[PDB]
Amino acid sequence: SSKARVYADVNVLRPKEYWDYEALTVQWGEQDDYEVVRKVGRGKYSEVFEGINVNNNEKCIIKILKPVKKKKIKREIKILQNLCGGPNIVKLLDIVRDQHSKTPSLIFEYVNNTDFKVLYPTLTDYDIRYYIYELLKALDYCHSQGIMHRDVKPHNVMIDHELRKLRLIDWGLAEFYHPGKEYNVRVASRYFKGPELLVDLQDYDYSLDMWSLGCMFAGMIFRKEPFFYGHDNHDQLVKIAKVLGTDGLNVYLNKYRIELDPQLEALVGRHSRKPWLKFMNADNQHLVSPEAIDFLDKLLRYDHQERLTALEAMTHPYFQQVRAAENS
Ligand SMILES: O=c1[nH]c(CN2CC[C@H](O)C2)nc2c1oc1ccc(Br)cc12
Structure with a gap:
């Protein structure tokens, strides 16, 4: 074919x-390290915010995902990790989640x-x-x-x-x-x-x-x-x-x-x-x-x-x- x-x-x-992205075990970071400053985007699967990393006071973007299947999210995560550093690919900096709801956020360069x-x-x-x-x-x-x-x-x-x-x-x-x-x-x-x-x-x-x-x-x-x-x-x-x-x-x-x-x-x-x-x-x-x-x-x-x-x-x-x- x-x-x-x-x-x-x-x-x-x-x-x-x-x-083999379903084999990934996600290493979750600290939700508290990234504070939302204001909304900048949205789509069917996320709401996106400009944020601050409270450790170094650097800007970042916080993509808060709408409820999503484990397989689906491991695919985005593993693809981002594999491409991080390549020319003009957005860099995934961290991955965190709310403990109560388990809502995941991907943190990116701003x-x-x-x-x-x-x-x-x-x-x-x-x-x-x-x-x-x-x-x-x-x-x-x-x-x-x-x-x-x-x-x-x-x-x-x-x-x-x-x-x-x-x-x-x-x-x-x-x-x-x-x-x-x-x-x-x-x-x-x-x-x-x-x-x-x-x-x-x-x-x-x-x-x-x-x-x-x-x-x-x-x-x-x-x-x-x-x-x-x-x-x-x-x-x-x-x-x-x-x-x-x-x-x-x-x-x-x-x-x-x-x-x-x-x-x-x-x-x-x-x-x-x-x-x-x-x-x-x-x-x-x-x-x-x-x-x-x-x-x-x-x-x-x-x-x-x-x-x-x-x-x-x-x-x-x-x-x-x-x-x-x-x-x-
Ligand atoms: O992974 C993302 N997704 C979205 C939202 N989507 C749906 C609307 C648009 O198709 C895009 N924005 C960003 C995403 O990563 C970003 C990194 C920096 C900046 Br600035 C914005 C974003």
Whole structure:
């Protein structure tokens, strides 16, 4: 069946301890060491606060989890511990719990984030090259360490724009990649779901995060967020098919021997491919170079095996000034 084209044996070669997250025994820290200062975020699975570490008076972020199954939380914890220290991965600093209720908190490094809806309009052409390159560092790293993030989107990319610092967060949906394993397709967030999730191809791989990144990147260069704006999962595939065209979708489905639900097939219809330049207009013109569009094109492919890997993406000429700058 389908397999990743890179990093496919990472968890085969590492000790079982690295990936066997249910075997983790969590070493709980002192709940009292971290005080909540104010709320900064939330989602279906947590409430997030800026905090202080009372030992050293340093800022931190406190993610207070909503009731969660042991298996699920050990997965997030072990993935964070495995990736701690890697480029642009949020650092997990401690893990603590309330004694009475046993409510767990993950403690992270602090970032002064500006939400994307307010930050991304202010980014220059070069700023988008720079921040996407920094995000790619994180994704090549996690994929190289045998992990798929499975929820890449702007809400999970913290940026302190004054310091030009980026951290990829919220590993709640991340998993370890094992060849031929069939994963749950109910991952990512709708506007960023790959076609493989939307047609029920379960033997997907790191390439799923490259689709999500392409969706984010198309929203930034075209100033059209979200770029594929579906209402439900079926409509999400329709929004894609109206852009990339149904010919390529049919080639993909035939390659992997997938049949669409008859309902879905009828909704998707038949559509011509819409060239990327048709998305160009006066709000976005300052961002839409031929290098940007080439790079985007090589991420947004139906066939997950055709997409650029994160390592290839980093070497695309679109980023050549960011690389030159970073050589020093
Ligand atoms: O692991 C997290 N999760 C969330 C909450 N989620 C759900 C909303 C968004 O998708 C993200 N925030 C943070 C998480 O880690 C953080 C580290 C620093 C900062 Br600043 C914020 C966070």
